[PDB]
Write a protein that binds this ligand. Structure first.
Ligand SMILES: CCCCC/C=C/C/C=C/C/C=C\C/C=C\CCCC(=O)O[C@H](COC(=O)CCCCCCCCCCCCCCCCC)COP(=O)(O)O[C@@H]1[C@H](O)[C@H](O)[C@@H](OP(=O)(O)O)[C@H](OP(=O)(O)O)[C@H]1O
Ligand SMILES: *[C@@H]1O[C@H](CO)[C@@H](O[C@@H]2O[C@H](CO)[C@@H](O[C@@H]3O[C@H](CO)[C@@H](O[C@@H]4O[C@H](CO)[C@@H](O)[C@H](O)[C@H]4NC(C)=O)[C@H](O)[C@H]3NC(C)=O)[C@H](O)[C@H]2NC(C)=O)[C@H](O)[C@H]1NC(C)=O
Ligand SMILES: CCCCCCCCCCCCCCCCCC(=O)OC[C@H](COP(=O)(O)OCCN)OC(=O)CCCCCCCCCCCCCCCCC
Ligand SMILES: CCCCCCCCCCCCCCCCCC(=O)OC[C@H](COP(=O)(O)OCCN)OC(=O)CCCCCCCCCCCCCCCCC
Ligand SMILES: *[C@@H]1O[C@H](CO)[C@@H](O[C@@H]2O[C@H](CO)[C@@H](O[C@@H]3O[C@H](CO)[C@@H](O)[C@H](O)[C@H]3NC(C)=O)[C@H](O)[C@H]2NC(C)=O)[C@H](O)[C@H]1NC(C)=O
Ligand SMILES: CC(C)CCC[C@@H](C)[C@H]1CC[C@H]2[C@@H]3CC=C4C[C@@H](OC(=O)CCC(=O)O)CC[C@]4(C)[C@H]3CC[C@]12C
Ligand SMILES: CC(C)CCC[C@@H](C)[C@H]1CC[C@H]2[C@@H]3CC=C4C[C@@H](OC(=O)CCC(=O)O)CC[C@]4(C)[C@H]3CC[C@]12C
Ligand SMILES: *[C@@H]1O[C@H](CO)[C@@H](O[C@@H]2O[C@H](CO)[C@@H](O)[C@H](O)[C@H]2NC(C)=O)[C@H](O)[C@H]1NC(C)=O
Ligand SMILES: CC(C)CCC[C@@H](C)[C@H]1CC[C@H]2[C@@H]3CC=C4C[C@@H](O)CC[C@]4(C)[C@H]3CC[C@]12C
Ligand SMILES: CC(C)CCC[C@@H](C)[C@H]1CC[C@H]2[C@@H]3CC=C4C[C@@H](O)CC[C@]4(C)[C@H]3CC[C@]12C
Ligand SMILES: *[C@@H]1O[C@H](CO)[C@@H](O)[C@H](O)[C@H]1NC(C)=O
Ligand SMILES: [Ca+2]
Ligand SMILES: [Ca+2]
Lengths: 23, 195, 195, 240, 146, 386
């Protein structure tokens, strides 16, 4: 039996920073 | 001549971690020297004439150096990064020292003969460059992509054309050519096969 | 006879200072190594050795003008190299860090499969271009041909005034070294032999 | 001047190629590979015009024309070659930059002038070869298989701790710590610089005369058999 | 009892026996050898240069501690006259003369048998540069004389 | 709660020269701090000597204490000692209470000296990993084309082996390799539970790969996306991530990303491994477009840090969920690093909420400050069951 908690694909996530623009 | 000597002294004092006052002083002295040299190349060109001024080869060199210095100055403001270093070439204007001596004729005749056979010099240099290119292509075919060893890939490899031509030039100079030979032999199989 | 005078006076001074404690031991060492000039006394006594020494000195005087020109060109190249490479020859012990403030503490050295704790220290390359004298020494080493691939790699990998190296950052800078090899070891040194 | 443009473009195409290990290829590699048969066709057309203008065995009487014909023939064979033994034929396309030597007679005259001063050097090379051979033989008589001993710790995994030869007791270099000099270890430089047979000795002597790493071989002999007499082999070798 | 292994060289000498067939190598080799034997004082001057520089290196950098993974070690050092001459010849040909120069500059760990605890000097710059220049100049002078 | 409240009121001093920080660094016999010499009385319930007067701080070998981030952490974490003491006061039978920061240092109570080389990293610990992010459905794509041969192949193998160590029994992982043809590195063919046996099998399989062929990103990504849509077998039904281990390429393949993940339901993490001059443009573009991140691994020393940082990306939905995403979780029975035997650790993440009253920063508040943990020994459970 797996955990019954899942946290992903939030609408308010920024995700505007990568490792490419910074460096 | 004294102005050129002072310019050489000013440009020879640049060093790492110099005081900011010295940096600003040199920055302004570069402009002052450029303006002075520009005023000595216009007054001497009007007092001699464009055809008579360009007759001497060293005056043509001076004009080229002045144009390059102006280009460096304008290019060092729109994008201040590194710098070509043409402003140092004015130190060659100290070659006027030999004029007052008895060795002016001997040193001037060597430059006259060098300029006389310029096409031969260019042809010889181009033939050397062509042989270097041919050997670089041969090295690219023989060892291109085969230098990826278990440890770090050597910089002196034959993967790209610039790397291959640098390797060929270094082997021509003769420094550490045995290391490149060992790397090639290891790439081709080792001591057993590929020797 | 002047040289004989320095030899004798230095020996006498060393003997006089010997009969005491180690007063200025560095001066004692200097006066001790001064005694090497004893074989030089043989040059005058042997007429043939004096003649060959005179011939060597005459040959040296025959190329003084070209030596001066070569030194001027080398100084110009050294100044250009200082302008291009001053401050950029610093590196951290581990390649992960790029700044002096970051190169502090200890890191893990993954060599010879032992992963040892090694101290991080912001060092400078052995042959650099911080000032004109260091550039002259580096260019002399390059002209001799020993270890010039290392300085070529360091120059190519140099990034900025106070930043650590990055491989293949500025490859075009190799042109400089190529030009150097075209002008000094190849050209200039071959006109010494001819002269 | 249209044939010279074909050559310069071919040279630029050759310089733009990139080689990757184990069969990997960049898209530009295939893009440039697709350009080859137009070059081969242009070269074959020019060769055909020169043939129908000059004949055969006086067109082939010129060495540069012989080189051009060999280049175009190898290219044609590569085009019609599906077999995998084309490496010795695809390595001929590096002579293409030499074709512009044939197109410019001034470069031909310069090359003739530079190469006419190397014939009297040939005898020197012959003498040089003799010297190398002689020294090689001497090496083969003294340093045959002397660099194969190393300080293996305990024959656990046959991994030497130091990259220097041995001599068991003797004036040669000894092991420190818990190591013994067991038989067989490739050699100083991956086992390349040694005097096992005449070919290895010749290669080592040729490396020595160029004064590149000769001191490493001298030190290897010194710590393999003592430093009393090894200088008498290398100093005359370097000098001569 | 007696270490006798040099006699094999005699057999390796048979190569010289076939050097007489060539009518253009013998006349050149003999000519250059006879010119060499006519100018011994140039060689004497070069030998004096080597002697002086070897003695100077002995006096200045003699007591540098021998360490591996460096340029002053059991193979290349200034300890004895023969070792100094070997170092000078190695630098004259040119292998790691810059590395040797860096290996002795004013701050080297000093040997545990000498007197001074900090031996070595920054005089190695001038020493090595002048030695290289003078050796090259005298060798070129000998070449041109021959 | 106390850690969040204290860290909210932080001034972030840029210099610590005049006012040094006072803390007891472990594993000890520099300007910016002053150390503490404790008494270290020998105590029962622990196998070693401990001191209840303060809390010890462990900093990894490759992380330099005295940096601005570390000094600020040692500043604002000094308020946890009072809560440590109070928690012990309410329960004298309490084992280690630890706070592992995202910076890298762990502050644990009671103070005790640390246990050759020390490779311990707090962010690699299972109790930190289970609370740093929710369970996941990792799928590792490996570029095994000709260009990766040499150093950048053993580096990729080591990176994959270290990445597998960040999974647990609640995560599901699979490893696939592609060179103009995609395939599985082993005989699993679908996601596995990523337990000890499956992880060992995958490590053995990835240690035996060879580099040859021409890269084709389209086929590899199609294989990965079709593998992540199985639903025939047991999975985690949580974070779906494709972790790409390559060097460089000239193709970004908008077609595959548009076809498979149109609504961006699968994150893509891309790693550039080795020292090379290949084009990194598409590698970073695929990471940016798919809610992922871009990492560079140029040597072995960068393997450990870069293979653990992706959990910062996966923690954004948890921190943006709010107080509902704050539950105590218990790890599997493992062996304590401080030589205490078999223990289980409670876990509770800590959020960075500086200036959240005005709701204006919201930029670095998407990451966790760290993870709190408390150790429960199996001997206590045995004692509760006579
Ligand atoms: C070959 C492999 C690679 C080689 C690398 C280096 C190759 C070159 C390396 C060494 C060559 C140089 C050797 C020694 C150099 C100079 C010796 C002494 C100066 C010397 O040679 O004389 C210069 C050379 O000028 C240069 O271009 C100055 C030379 C600068 C050359 C730098 C550029 C080199 C790159 C070539 C670029 C293209 C040019 C030519 O002499 P000149 O023609 O100026 O002589 C006149 C003449 O005496 C007149 O009577 C006099 O006018 P009056 O006042 O009416 O008497 C003129 O006075 P002004 O000077 O006021 O006009 C003199 O200047
Ligand atoms: C919790 O989140 C808050 C904000 O949401 C965060 O507080 C912020 O911390 C950063 C530092 O990480 C502060 O940044 C200031 O401004 C710049 C940007 O970092 C710094 O100047 C240099 O910046 C470069 C890169 O931009 C950097 O490499 C360099 O080291 C910096 N310093 C130099 C060159 O000296 C400032 O130094 C930095 N600090 C100042 C100005 O004091 C933000 O200002 C902070 N914002 C707020 C509202 O406080 C906090 O750190 C998060 N919690 C944790 C534990 O990190
Ligand atoms: C145109 C081209 C012309 C080419 C001409 C070439 C001329 C130069 C030739 C140089 C040859 C002499 C140098 C020999 C190298 C010595 C190598 C060596 O290690 O010898 C030691 C050897 C025994 O080795 P050891 O380590 O002592 O014992 C343990 C291993 N057996 O043996 C010993 O125990 C010591 C014996 C060796 C040292 C003395 C050898 C005689 C040298 C006399 C002077 C040079 C004679 C030149 C003869 C020319 C023809 C060969
Ligand atoms: C005026 C001086 C010379 C001028 C030369 C001019 C230029 C010519 C070319 C340069 C010649 C350089 C020759 C260098 C030879 C070095 C020989 C050597 O290193 O041999 C080692 C060994 C003794 O080495 P050492 O360390 O002194 O002693 C160890 C034991 N106590 O050696 C021996 O055992 C030597 C055996 C006897 C040799 C006698 C000579
Ligand atoms: C991070 O470091 C800071 C400086 O090292 C700490 O700031 C210091 O905290 C002290 C304790 O609160 C203060 O001492 C007293 O503060 C009261 C406040 O009203 C005043 O009486 C005085 O300022 C002071 N009294 C005496 C007798 O010293 C310091 O003033 C204060 N600032 C300093 C030392 O510059 C932070 O507390 C620390 N962070 C944490 C979380 O502890
Ligand atoms: C062509 C002619 C006109 C030039 C004459 C010689 C000077 C211009 C050169 C020769 C010595 C050079 C000096 C060589 C050594 C040094 C020391 C150097 O000082 C430092 O490095 C201090 C910084 C530090 O090390 O902490 C500054 C450059 C300076 C004086 C150089 C400045 C330019 C100098 C004075
Ligand atoms: C007698 C002379 C002419 C012999 C040498 C001929 C030079 C013109 C050759 C040898 C070195 C070559 C250089 C070798 C290395 C480089 C750097 C390189 O520049 C790049 O930007 C490479 C791009 C990349 O990083 O992929 C290619 C040009 C350049 C200077 C080459 C240009 C042609 C050079 C200058
Ligand atoms: C399991 O996955 C497959 C495909 O990934 C699903 O589709 C079935 O595939 C099998 C292949 O042998 C075939 O029965 C049919 O092509 C598909 N079945 C259909 C369309 O009913 C399959 O539905 C998934 N689930 C199960 C329980 O098999
Ligand atoms: C002919 C004699 C006097 C040589 C004088 C010309 C020398 C100093 C010139 C000729 C070509 C020049 C180089 C041409 C291109 C570049 C690339 C640039 O990004 C940095 C400077 C650098 C590397 C220049 C340095 C100066 C240079 C080497
Ligand atoms: C006297 C002859 C050789 C003329 C050459 C003089 C110059 C080039 C040489 C001669 C002796 C040398 C000095 C000898 C010893 C030392 C001690 C060292 O810790 C610093 C450098 C210093 C001070 C040297 C500097 C360079 C020096 C002054
Ligand atoms: C292995 O090492 C031991 C001591 O370390 C020593 O007896 C010997 O070198 C080896 N033992 C053998 C060969 O039995
Ligand atoms: Ca060399
Ligand atoms: Ca690839």
């Amino acid at each position: 039996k797996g955990p019954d908690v899942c946290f992903d694909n939030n609408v308010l996530e920024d995700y505007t920073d990568c490792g490419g623009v910074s460096g | 001549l004294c102005v050129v000597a002072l310019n050489t002294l000013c440009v020879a004092m640049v060093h790492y971690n110099q005081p900011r006052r010295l940096t600003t002083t040199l920055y302004f002295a570069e402009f002052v020297f450029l303006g002075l040299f520009l005023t000595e190349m216009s007054l001497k060109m009007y007092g001699l004439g464009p055809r008579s001024y360009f007759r001497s080869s060293f005056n043509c060199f001076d004009f080229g150096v002045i144009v390059g210095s102006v280009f460096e100055v304008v290019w060092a403001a729109i994008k201040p990064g590194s710098s070509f270093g043409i402003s140092v070439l004015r130190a060659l204007r100290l070659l006027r020292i030999f004029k007052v001596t008895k060795y002016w004729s001997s040193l001037r005749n060597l430059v006259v003969s060098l300029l006389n056979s310029m096409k031969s010099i260019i042809s010889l240099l181009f033939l050397l460059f062509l042989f270097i290119v041919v050997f670089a292509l041969l090295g690219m075919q023989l060892f291109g992509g085969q230098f990826n060893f278990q440890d770090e890939t050597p910089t002196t490899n034959f993967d790209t054309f610039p790397a291959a031509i640098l390797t060929v030039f270094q082997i021509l100079t003769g420094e550490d050519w045995n290391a490149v030979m060992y790397h090639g032999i290891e790439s081709q199989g080792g001591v057993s096969k590929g020797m | 006879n002047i040289l004989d005078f320095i030899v004798v006076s230095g020996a006498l001074v060393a003997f006089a200072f010997s009969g005491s404690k180690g007063k200025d031991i560095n001066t004692i060492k200097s006066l001790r190594v001064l005694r090497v000039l004893r074989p030089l006394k043989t040059i005058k006594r042997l007429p043939k050795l004096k003649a060959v020494f005179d011939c060597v000195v005459n040959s040296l005087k025959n190329v003084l003008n070209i030596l001066i020109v070569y030194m001027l060109f080398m100084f110009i190249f050294a100044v250009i190299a200082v302008q291009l490479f001053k401050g950029k020859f610093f590196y951290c012990t581990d390649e992960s860090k790029e700044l002096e403030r970051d190169c502090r503490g200890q890191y893990l050295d993954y060599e010879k499969e032992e992963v040892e704790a090694q101290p991080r220290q912001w060092k400078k390359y052995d042959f650099h271009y911080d000032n004109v004298l260091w550039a002259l020494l580096t260019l002399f080493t390059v002209s001799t041909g020993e270890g010039w691939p290392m300085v070529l790699k360091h120059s190519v990998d140099a990034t900025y005034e106070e930043q650590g190296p990055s491989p293949g950052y500025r490859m075009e800078l190799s042109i400089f070294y190529v030009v150097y090899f075209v002008v000094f070891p190849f050209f200039f040194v071959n006109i010494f032999v001819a002269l | 001047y249209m044939i010279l443009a074909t050559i310069i473009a071919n040279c630029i195409v050759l310089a733009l190629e990139q080689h990757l290990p184990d069969g990997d290829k960049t898209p530009m590699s295939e893009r440039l590979d697709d350009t080859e048969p137009y070059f081969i066709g242009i070269f074959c057309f020019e060769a055909g015009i020169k043939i129908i203008a000059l004949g055969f065995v006086s067109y082939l009487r010129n060495g540069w024309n012989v080189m051009d014909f060999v280049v175009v023939l190898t290219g044609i064979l590569a085009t019609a070659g599906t077999d995998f033994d084309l490496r010795t034929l695809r390595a001929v396309r590096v002579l293409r930059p030499l074709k512009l030597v044939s197109g410019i007679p001034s470069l031909q005259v310069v090359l003739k002038s530079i190469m006419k001063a190397m014939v009297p050097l040939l005898q020197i090379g012959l003498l040089l070869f003799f010297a190398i051979l002689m020294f090689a033989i001497i090496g083969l008589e003294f340093y045959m298989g002397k660099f194969h001993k190393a300080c293996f710790p305990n024959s656990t995994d046959a991994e030497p701790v130091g990259d220097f030869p041995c001599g068991k007791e003797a004036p040669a270099r000894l092991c420190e710590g818990d190591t013994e000099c067991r038989e067989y270890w490739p050699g100083p430089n991956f086992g390349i610089t040694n005097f096992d047979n005449i070919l290895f000795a010749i290669l080592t002597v040729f490396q020595c005369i160029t004064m590149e790493g000769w001191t490493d071989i001298l030190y290897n002999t010194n710590d393999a058999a003592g430093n009393t007499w090894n200088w008498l082999y290398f100093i005359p070798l370097i000098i001569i | 009892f007696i270490n006798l292994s040099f006699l094999r060289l005699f057999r390796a000498a048979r190569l010289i026996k076939l050097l007489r067939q060539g009518y253009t190598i013998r006349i050149l080799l003999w000519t250059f050898v006879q010119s060499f034997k006519a100018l011994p004082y140039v060689c004497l001057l070069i030998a004096m240069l080597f002697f002086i520089y070897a003695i100077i290196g002995m006096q200045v950098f003699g007591n540098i501690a021998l360490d591996d993974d460096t340029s002053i070690n059991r193979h290349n050092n200034f300890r004895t006259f023969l070792q100094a001459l070997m170092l000078l010849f190695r630098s004259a040909t040119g292998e790691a003369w810059h590395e040797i120069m860096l290996s002795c500059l004013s701050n080297q760990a000093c040997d545990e048998q000498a007197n001074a605890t900090e031996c070595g000097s920054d005089f190695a710059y001038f020493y090595f540069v002048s030695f290289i220049f003078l050796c090259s100049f005298l060798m070129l002078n000998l070449f041109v004389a021959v | 709660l106390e850690a969040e409240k204290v860290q909210a009121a932080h001034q972030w001093r840029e210099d610590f020269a005049s006012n040094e920080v006072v803390y007891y660094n472990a594993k000890d016999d520099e300007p910016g701090s002053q150390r503490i010499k404790p008494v270290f009385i020998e105590d029962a319930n622990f196998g070693r000597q401990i001191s209840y007067q303060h809390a010890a701080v462990h900093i990894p070998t490759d992380i330099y204490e005295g940096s601005t981030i570390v000094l600020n952490e040692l500043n604002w974490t000094s308020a946890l000692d009072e809560v440590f003491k109070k928690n012990r006061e309410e329960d004298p039978s309490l084992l280690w209470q630890v706070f592992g920061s995202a910076t890298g240092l762990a502050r644990y109570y009671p103070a005790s000296p640390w246990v050759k080389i020390d490779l311990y990293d707090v962010r690699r610990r299972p109790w930190y990993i289970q609370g740093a992010a929710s369970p996941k459905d990792m799928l590792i794509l490996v570029d095994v084309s000709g260009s990766v041969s040499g150093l950048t192949l053993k580096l990729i193998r080591t990176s994959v082996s270290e990445m597998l160590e960040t999974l647990s029994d609640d995560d599901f992982v699979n490893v696939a390799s592609f060179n103009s043809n995609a395939q599985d590195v082993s005989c699993f063919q679908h996601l596995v539970q990523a337990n000890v046996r499956n992880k060992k099998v995958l490590k053995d399989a990835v240690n035996n790969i060879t580099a040859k062929g021409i890269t084709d990103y389209k086929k590899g990504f199609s294989f990965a996306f079709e593998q992540l849509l199985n639903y025939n077998v047991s999975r985690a039904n949580c974070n779906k991530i494709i972790m790409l281990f390559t060097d460089g390429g000239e193709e970004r393949a908008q077609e595959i990303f548009n076809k498979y993940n149109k609504d961006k339901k699968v994150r893509v993490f891309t790693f550039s491994v080795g020292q090379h001059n290949y084009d990194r443009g598409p590698i970073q573009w695929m990471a940016c477009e798919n809610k992922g991140y871009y990492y560079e691994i140029p040597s072995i020393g960068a393997i450990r840090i870069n293979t653990q940082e992706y959990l910062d990306v996966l923690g954004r939905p948890m921190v943006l969920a709010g107080d509902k995403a704050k539950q105590v979780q218990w790890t599997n029975v493992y062996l304590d690093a401080l030589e205490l035997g078999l223990v289980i650790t409670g876990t509770l993440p800590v959020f960075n909420i500086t200036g959240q009253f005005e709701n204006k920063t919201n930029l670095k508040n998407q990451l966790i400050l760290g993870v709190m943990g408390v150790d429960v020994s199996l001997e206590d459970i045995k004692r509760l069951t006579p």
